[PDB]
Design a protein around this ligand. Structure first.
Ligand SMILES: CC(C)(C)S(=O)(=O)C[C@H](C1CC1)N1C(=O)[C@](C)(Cc2ccc(C(=O)O)cn2)O[C@H](c2cccc(Cl)c2)[C@H]1c1ccc(Cl)cc1
Length: 99
């Protein structure tokens, strides 16, 4: 129910957040059953989502294409690198309240 990364301080990935309605629906579409999460939890579910709807079928280039997927609207970008973790958190932050 969680994924952490070496690029973000360990404590930041425990930050408690309430996803805004769109982020929440994405989380809930892949099993999430609550409204309040830690950032590492959100990242886990977003990761699941990204892979259920095949937004990242090509693993060897580390790009998630999402221009015409909900994730694209959530992030407001057509695509992004899965290696650029700070940016991902940045984009996620916009779509939630920090408890
Ligand atoms: C199945 C896995 C391997 C458990 S996963 O982590 O859920 C897979 C997804 C994949 C859809 C893009 N994903 C990743 O593959 C990679 C890049 C795999 C990875 C994890 C850790 C480290 C490290 O600590 O150095 C390096 N690489 O991680 C993406 C990730 C994970 C946690 C936070 C962020 Cl911001 C990104 C992470 C990811 C990227 C984007 C989002 Cl929105 C969510 C998760």
């Amino acid at each position: 129910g969680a994924v952490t990364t070496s690029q973000i301080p360990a404590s930041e990935q425990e930050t408690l957040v309430r996803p805004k309605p769109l982020l929440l629906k994405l989380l809930k579409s892949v099993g999430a059953q609550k409204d309040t999460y830690t950032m590492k939890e959100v990242l886990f579910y977003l990761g699941q989502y990204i892979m259920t709807k095949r937004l990242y079928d090509e693993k060897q280039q580390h790009i998630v294409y999402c221009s015409n997927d909900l994730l694209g609207d959530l992030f407001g970008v057509p695509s992004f690198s899965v290696k650029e973790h700070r940016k991902i958190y940045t984009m996620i932050y916009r779509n939630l309240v920090v408890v």
